[PDB]
Amino acid sequence: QKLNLMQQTMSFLTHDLTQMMPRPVRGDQGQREPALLAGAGVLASESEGMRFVRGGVVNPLMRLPRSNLLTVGYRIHDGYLERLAWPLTDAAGSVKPTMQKLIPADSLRLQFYDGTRWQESWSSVQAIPVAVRMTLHSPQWGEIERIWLLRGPQ
């Protein structure tokens, strides 16, 4: 249960991060924004935040005019890790994200592996990392670190 929520959390994260796309986006008013936006206060996070595009939507009949990509994000809000999901890319500001309260958590720190070194910030417009290291502090578990590959071996 405490375990279920953590397992859920890790599941959401793995499914999102491991299918990240090197796709720049248009923001709430159509402004150009980077493929991966990450750092202090991203999505009004109380800690670090991140926002990116991922694929892997399976919709083999392709019945509605929609692509197989989504925009997702993670932040700390009200003492919780929270997942935000938009149902498509480059969404109008009228389009509001779903919000999923995940584990209690109070600090999210991110590092990014560029293919050579680990760096603390990400600033490319088009390119995405090879790997991401996430650290957070959970009142239920303590300090948790996880490394994800974003796009397999290089």
Partner: protein
């Protein structure tokens, strides 16, 4: 119970990373001293199967440049209708689509991919089309990241999308570099488009053409005009830098399909650009 599955799916992704590692291996080894990309090379024999504890992987590699790259529409141009637009209208026409609708879609695609927010086509539309939708959004105004982004353009449906899918792609290049050596005979409508004949591909040499000039000067293309040949020369290739990996992974009851786009980085260096779970 969920601990086991989550471990196993994690292990299903790691086998996908294993699958990809093998692909990059096979590509480096078969292409190391090779100047071209053709279907008698070792990478093109498949699928390969490997056992894993409680499962297996199946892997198949294909030439990602064996298709019409829609991102050729991102190419800086200064003509009222560039070549990629002409060719796509010709391609779409050949899928039982009336002249009008084929134009609407191609022009809509042009406007969706071109970086400006202004209209320059009779039938194509920019942000207004897309803000008007049930779930409103903006026009990408950049190269497509995935072929699925085309589903959303003006005059598109599921039937046509699925007809178009085997023939067009979204590569991270604005060039049209179609590898004539790897086009399947079934993709022969592409050639029909590009020539304004499965015979050409049916009769392709065992180890492909040495170059595009050799392709273009074969007896079968005697009567085609010089201008068509000069522009075909700008869009065809005998080489490739992009491959698709399909991996089908099984761990106990878990079945996962992964599609990975691989880029050639050096003579013996290939990398995965991105990957996604795909339809079976």
């Amino acid at each position: 119970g969920r601990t086991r599955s989550q471990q196993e799916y994690q292990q299903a992704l790691w086998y996908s990373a294993s699958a990809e590692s093998l692909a990059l291996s096979a590509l480096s080894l078969s292409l190391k001293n090779e100047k071209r990309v053709h279907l008698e090379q070792p990478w093109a024999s498949g699928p390969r199967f490997f056992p894993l504890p409680q499962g297996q992987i199946a892997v198949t590699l294909r030439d990602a440049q064996a298709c019409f790259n829609l991102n050729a529409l991102a190419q800086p141009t200064t003509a009222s209708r560039p070549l990629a637009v002409q060719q796509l209208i010709a391609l779409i026409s050949r899928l039982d689509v009336p002249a009008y609708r084929a134009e609407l879609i191609a022009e809509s695609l042009w406007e969706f991919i071109d970086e400006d927010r202004s209209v320059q086509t009779r039938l194509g539309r920019e942000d207004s089309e897309y803000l008007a939708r049930s779930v409103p959004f903006y026009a990408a105004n950049q190269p497509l990241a995935d072929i699925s982004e085309m589903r959303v353009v003006q005059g598109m449906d599921a039937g046509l999308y699925q007809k178009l899918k085997p023939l067009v792609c979204a590569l991270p290049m604005t060039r049209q570099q179609i590898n004539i050596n790897t086009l399947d005979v079934t993709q022969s409508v592409i050639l029909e488009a590009l020539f304004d004949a499965r015979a050409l591909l049916q009769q392709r040499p065992a180890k492909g053409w040495e170059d595009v000039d050799q392709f273009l000067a074969q007896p079968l293309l005697a009567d085609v005009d010089e201008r068509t040949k000069k522009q075909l020369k700008t869009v065809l290739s005998v080489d490739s830098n992009y491959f698709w990996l399909r991996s089908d992974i099984t761990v106990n009851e878990i079945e996962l399909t992964m599609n990975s786009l691989i880029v050639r980085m050096g003579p013996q260096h290939f990398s995965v650009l991105w990957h996604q779970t795909g339809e079976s």
